[PDB]
Every structure is written in C-alpha cells, then in structure tokens.
Coordinates of N, CA and C in Angstrom, one line a residue:
Chain A
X1 N -14.4 -17.2 11.0 CA -14.8 -16.2 12.0 C -14.4 -14.8 11.7
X2 N -15.4 -13.9 11.5 CA -15.2 -12.5 11.0 C -14.6 -11.6 12.0
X3 N -14.8 -11.8 13.3 CA -14.2 -11.0 14.4 C -12.7 -11.3 14.5
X4 N -12.3 -12.6 14.4 CA -10.9 -13.0 14.4 C -10.2 -12.3 13.2
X5 N -10.9 -12.3 12.1 CA -10.4 -11.7 10.9 C -10.2 -10.2 11.1
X6 N -11.3 -9.5 11.6 CA -11.2 -8.1 11.8 C -10.1 -7.7 12.8
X7 N -10.0 -8.5 13.8 CA -9.0 -8.4 14.8 C -7.6 -8.4 14.2
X8 N -7.3 -9.3 13.3 CA -6.0 -9.4 12.6 C -5.8 -8.2 11.7
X9 N -6.8 -7.7 11.0 CA -6.7 -6.5 10.1 C -6.4 -5.3 10.9
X10 N -7.1 -5.1 12.1 CA -6.8 -4.0 13.0 C -5.4 -4.0 13.5
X11 N -5.0 -5.2 13.9 CA -3.6 -5.4 14.4 C -2.6 -5.0 13.3
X12 N -2.8 -5.4 12.1 CA -1.9 -5.1 10.9 C -1.8 -3.6 10.7
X13 N -3.0 -2.9 10.7 CA -3.1 -1.5 10.6 C -2.3 -0.7 11.7
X14 N -2.3 -1.2 12.9 CA -1.6 -0.6 13.9 C -0.1 -0.8 13.7
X15 N 0.3 -2.0 13.3 CA 1.7 -2.2 13.1 C 2.2 -1.4 11.9
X16 N 1.4 -1.3 10.9 CA 1.7 -0.5 9.7 C 1.9 1.0 10.0
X17 N 1.2 1.6 11.0 CA 1.3 3.0 11.4 C 2.6 3.2 12.1
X18 N 2.9 2.2 12.9 CA 4.1 2.3 13.7 C 5.3 2.2 12.9
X19 N 5.3 1.3 11.8 CA 6.3 1.2 10.8 C 6.5 2.5 10.0
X20 N 5.4 3.2 9.6 CA 5.5 4.4 8.9 C 6.2 5.5 9.8
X21 N 5.8 5.6 11.1 CA 6.4 6.5 12.0 C 7.9 6.3 12.2
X22 N 8.3 5.0 12.2 CA 9.7 4.6 12.3 C 10.6 5.1 11.1
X23 N 10.0 4.9 9.9 CA 10.7 5.4 8.7 C 10.7 7.0 8.6
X24 N 9.7 7.6 9.2 CA 9.7 9.1 9.3 C 10.9 9.5 10.2
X25 N 11.2 8.7 11.2 CA 12.4 8.9 12.0 C 13.7 8.8 11.2
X26 N 13.8 7.7 10.4 CA 15.0 7.6 9.5 C 15.2 8.6 8.4
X27 N 14.0 9.2 8.0 CA 14.0 10.1 6.9 C 14.1 11.6 7.3
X28 N 13.7 11.8 8.6 CA 13.8 13.1 9.1 C 12.6 13.9 8.8
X29 N 11.5 13.2 8.6 CA 10.1 13.8 8.5 C 9.7 13.8 10.0
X30 N 9.0 14.9 10.5 CA 8.4 14.8 11.8 C 7.0 15.4 11.9
Chain B
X1 N -13.6 -17.6 -0.6 CA -13.2 -18.5 0.5 C -12.5 -17.8 1.6
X2 N -13.2 -17.9 2.8 CA -12.8 -17.1 4.0 C -11.5 -17.6 4.7
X3 N -11.2 -18.9 4.6 CA -9.9 -19.5 5.0 C -8.7 -19.0 4.2
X4 N -8.9 -19.0 2.9 CA -7.9 -18.5 2.0 C -7.6 -17.0 2.4
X5 N -8.7 -16.3 2.6 CA -8.6 -14.9 3.0 C -7.9 -14.7 4.3
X6 N -8.3 -15.5 5.3 CA -7.7 -15.4 6.6 C -6.2 -15.8 6.6
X7 N -5.9 -16.8 5.8 CA -4.5 -17.2 5.5 C -3.7 -16.1 5.0
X8 N -4.2 -15.3 4.0 CA -3.4 -14.2 3.5 C -3.2 -13.1 4.5
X9 N -4.3 -12.8 5.3 CA -4.2 -11.8 6.4 C -3.1 -12.2 7.4
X10 N -3.1 -13.4 7.8 CA -2.1 -13.9 8.8 C -0.7 -13.9 8.2
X11 N -0.5 -14.2 7.0 CA 0.7 -14.1 6.3 C 1.2 -12.6 6.3
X12 N 0.3 -11.7 6.0 CA 0.7 -10.3 5.9 C 1.1 -9.8 7.3
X13 N 0.4 -10.2 8.3 CA 0.7 -9.9 9.7 C 2.1 -10.4 10.1
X14 N 2.5 -11.5 9.7 CA 3.8 -12.0 10.0 C 4.9 -11.3 9.3
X15 N 4.6 -11.0 8.0 CA 5.6 -10.2 7.3 C 5.8 -8.8 7.8
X16 N 4.7 -8.2 8.2 CA 4.7 -6.9 8.8 C 5.5 -6.8 10.2
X17 N 5.5 -7.9 10.9 CA 6.2 -8.0 12.2 C 7.7 -8.1 12.0
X18 N 8.0 -8.8 10.9 CA 9.4 -9.0 10.5 C 10.0 -7.7 9.9
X19 N 9.1 -7.0 9.2 CA 9.5 -5.6 8.7 C 9.7 -4.6 9.8
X20 N 8.9 -4.7 10.9 CA 9.1 -3.8 12.0 C 10.4 -4.1 12.7
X21 N 10.7 -5.4 12.9 CA 11.9 -5.8 13.6 C 13.2 -5.3 12.8
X22 N 13.1 -5.4 11.4 CA 14.2 -5.0 10.6 C 14.5 -3.5 10.7
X23 N 13.5 -2.7 10.7 CA 13.6 -1.3 11.0 C 14.1 -0.9 12.4
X24 N 13.7 -1.7 13.4 CA 14.3 -1.6 14.7 C 15.8 -1.8 14.7
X25 N 16.2 -2.7 13.8 CA 17.7 -2.8 13.6 C 18.3 -1.6 12.9
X26 N 17.7 -1.0 11.9 CA 18.3 0.2 11.3 C 18.3 1.4 12.3
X27 N 17.3 1.4 13.2 CA 17.1 2.6 14.1 C 17.9 2.4 15.4
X28 N 18.2 1.2 15.7 CA 19.0 1.0 16.9 C 18.1 0.9 18.1
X29 N 16.8 0.5 17.9 CA 15.9 0.1 19.0 C 16.1 -1.4 19.1
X30 N 16.1 -1.9 20.3 CA 16.3 -3.4 20.5 C 15.3 -3.9 21.6
Chain C
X1 N -19.1 -6.6 10.3 CA -19.5 -5.6 9.2 C -18.4 -5.5 8.2
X2 N -18.8 -5.9 7.0 CA -17.9 -6.0 5.8 C -17.3 -4.7 5.2
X3 N -18.1 -3.7 5.3 CA -17.7 -2.3 4.9 C -16.6 -1.8 5.8
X4 N -16.8 -2.0 7.1 CA -15.8 -1.6 8.1 C -14.5 -2.3 7.8
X5 N -14.6 -3.6 7.6 CA -13.5 -4.4 7.2 C -12.8 -4.0 6.0
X6 N -13.6 -3.7 4.9 CA -13.0 -3.3 3.6 C -12.4 -1.9 3.8
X7 N -13.0 -1.0 4.6 CA -12.5 0.2 4.9 C -11.1 0.1 5.5
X8 N -10.9 -0.8 6.5 CA -9.6 -0.9 7.1 C -8.6 -1.5 6.1
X9 N -9.0 -2.5 5.3 CA -8.1 -3.0 4.3 C -7.6 -2.0 3.3
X10 N -8.5 -1.1 2.8 CA -8.1 0.0 1.9 C -7.2 1.0 2.6
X11 N -7.4 1.3 3.9 CA -6.6 2.2 4.7 C -5.1 1.6 4.7
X12 N -5.1 0.3 5.0 CA -3.8 -0.4 5.2 C -3.0 -0.4 3.8
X13 N -3.7 -0.6 2.7 CA -3.1 -0.5 1.4 C -2.6 0.9 1.1
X14 N -3.2 1.9 1.5 CA -2.7 3.2 1.3 C -1.5 3.5 2.1
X15 N -1.5 3.0 3.4 CA -0.4 3.3 4.2 C 0.9 2.5 3.7
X16 N 0.6 1.3 3.2 CA 1.6 0.4 2.7 C 2.3 1.0 1.4
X17 N 1.6 1.8 0.6 CA 2.1 2.4 -0.6 C 3.0 3.6 -0.3
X18 N 2.5 4.3 0.8 CA 3.2 5.4 1.3 C 4.5 5.0 2.0
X19 N 4.5 3.9 2.7 CA 5.7 3.2 3.2 C 6.7 2.8 2.1
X20 N 6.2 2.2 1.1 CA 7.1 1.8 0.0 C 7.8 3.0 -0.7
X21 N 7.0 4.1 -0.9 CA 7.6 5.3 -1.4 C 8.7 5.9 -0.5
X22 N 8.5 5.9 0.8 CA 9.4 6.4 1.7 C 10.7 5.7 1.7
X23 N 10.7 4.3 1.6 CA 11.9 3.5 1.4 C 12.6 3.7 0.1
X24 N 11.8 4.0 -1.0 CA 12.4 4.4 -2.3 C 13.2 5.6 -2.1
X25 N 12.7 6.5 -1.3 CA 13.6 7.7 -0.9 C 14.9 7.4 -0.2
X26 N 14.8 6.5 0.8 CA 16.1 6.1 1.5 C 17.0 5.3 0.6
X27 N 16.5 4.6 -0.5 CA 17.3 3.7 -1.3 C 17.8 4.4 -2.5
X28 N 17.1 5.5 -2.9 CA 17.5 6.3 -4.1 C 16.9 5.7 -5.3
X29 N 15.8 5.0 -5.2 CA 15.0 4.6 -6.3 C 14.1 5.8 -6.5
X30 N 13.7 6.2 -7.8 CA 12.8 7.3 -8.0 C 11.8 6.9 -9.1
Chain D
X1 N -18.4 -7.0 -1.3 CA -17.9 -7.9 -2.3 C -16.6 -8.6 -1.9
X2 N -16.6 -9.9 -1.7 CA -15.5 -10.6 -1.2 C -14.3 -10.8 -2.1
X3 N -14.5 -10.8 -3.4 CA -13.4 -10.8 -4.4 C -12.6 -9.5 -4.5
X4 N -13.4 -8.4 -4.4 CA -12.7 -7.1 -4.2 C -11.9 -7.0 -3.0
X5 N -12.4 -7.5 -1.9 CA -11.7 -7.6 -0.7 C -10.5 -8.5 -0.8
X6 N -10.6 -9.7 -1.3 CA -9.5 -10.6 -1.5 C -8.4 -10.0 -2.4
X7 N -8.9 -9.3 -3.5 CA -8.0 -8.6 -4.4 C -7.2 -7.6 -3.6
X8 N -7.7 -6.8 -2.7 CA -7.0 -5.8 -2.0 C -6.0 -6.5 -1.1
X9 N -6.4 -7.6 -0.4 CA -5.5 -8.3 0.5 C -4.3 -8.9 -0.2
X10 N -4.5 -9.4 -1.4 CA -3.4 -10.0 -2.2 C -2.5 -8.9 -2.7
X11 N -3.0 -7.7 -3.1 CA -2.2 -6.6 -3.4 C -1.3 -6.1 -2.3
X12 N -1.9 -6.0 -1.1 CA -1.2 -5.6 0.1 C 0.0 -6.6 0.4
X13 N -0.3 -7.9 0.3 CA 0.7 -8.9 0.5 C 1.9 -8.8 -0.5
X14 N 1.6 -8.4 -1.7 CA 2.7 -8.3 -2.7 C 3.5 -7.0 -2.4
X15 N 2.8 -5.9 -2.0 CA 3.5 -4.7 -1.6 C 4.4 -4.9 -0.4
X16 N 3.9 -5.6 0.6 CA 4.6 -6.0 1.8 C 5.9 -6.8 1.6
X17 N 5.9 -7.7 0.5 CA 7.0 -8.5 0.2 C 8.1 -7.7 -0.4
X18 N 7.6 -6.7 -1.2 CA 8.5 -5.9 -1.9 C 9.2 -4.9 -1.0
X19 N 8.4 -4.4 0.0 CA 8.9 -3.6 1.2 C 10.0 -4.4 2.0
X20 N 9.7 -5.6 2.3 CA 10.7 -6.4 3.0 C 12.0 -6.6 2.3
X21 N 11.9 -6.8 1.0 CA 13.1 -7.0 0.1 C 13.9 -5.7 0.0
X22 N 13.2 -4.5 0.0 CA 13.9 -3.2 0.0 C 14.7 -2.9 1.2
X23 N 14.1 -3.3 2.4 CA 14.8 -3.2 3.7 C 16.0 -4.2 3.8
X24 N 15.8 -5.4 3.2 CA 17.0 -6.3 3.1 C 18.1 -5.7 2.4
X25 N 17.8 -4.9 1.3 CA 18.8 -4.1 0.7 C 19.5 -3.0 1.6
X26 N 18.7 -2.3 2.4 CA 19.3 -1.3 3.3 C 20.1 -2.0 4.4
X27 N 19.8 -3.2 4.8 CA 20.4 -3.9 5.9 C 21.6 -4.7 5.5
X28 N 21.6 -5.1 4.3 CA 22.7 -5.9 3.7 C 22.4 -7.4 4.0
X29 N 21.2 -7.8 4.1 CA 20.7 -9.1 4.1 C 20.5 -9.4 2.6
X30 N 20.9 -10.6 2.1 CA 20.6 -11.0 0.7 C 20.1 -12.4 0.5

C-alpha cells in the first residue's frame, strides 16, 4: 500500500527536521 | 519488491525515533 | 505518486547527510 | 524507477546507522 508507505516517508522527514533543529541547538547554530 | 521497501522504511523510522530520543538525552529534554 | 515519493526520499537523504556532518562537528571528526 | 528508489532508501538506512553510532559515542553508550 503506497499511501501507508508515503505516510511513513513523510513521518520520517518530519522527525529528521526535528533532529536537525535539535543538533542546531547543541551546536549553537540558530 | 514493495514489502522489502516498506520493511526498510519502517526500520529507518524506528532508528530515527531512537536517534531523536538520544539527542533529547544530550539536550536535557525528557 | 512515485515522483512525490522519490522527492521526499531524496529530501530525507540530503537532510540525513547534513545531520551526519553536524555530528562530525560535535565529535571532532573532519 | 523502483530500484533507484530502493537504492536511496538503503543509502539513508546506512547513514542513519552511522548517525546512531556517532551519538552513542557522544553519550558514552558502547
């Protein structure tokens, strides 16, 4: 099921953005 | 093979959650 | 839509590379 | 193209494992 698949890809993308922002906090990038 | 593909996406999602939790530990978010 | 899907996968890949480079900065790998 | 797609997913998975190991280094998990 391609919608299920796309759903998981979109979820991963959002988590990945949130991860990058958290590292920007540790690094002092803003 | 779409099951193989979905399998890898699900695996990536779980690793990504585990990564976000580990950074929450470094950041002091709980 | 497979192009939309591929688009999101490529985006995730680029964010993931950028994340790995940022951690290389925290770790002192260069 | 599904092979191209699977190729990128596998690449992301490998980068994600490498990212988790790097954080294990910052956290002192071994």
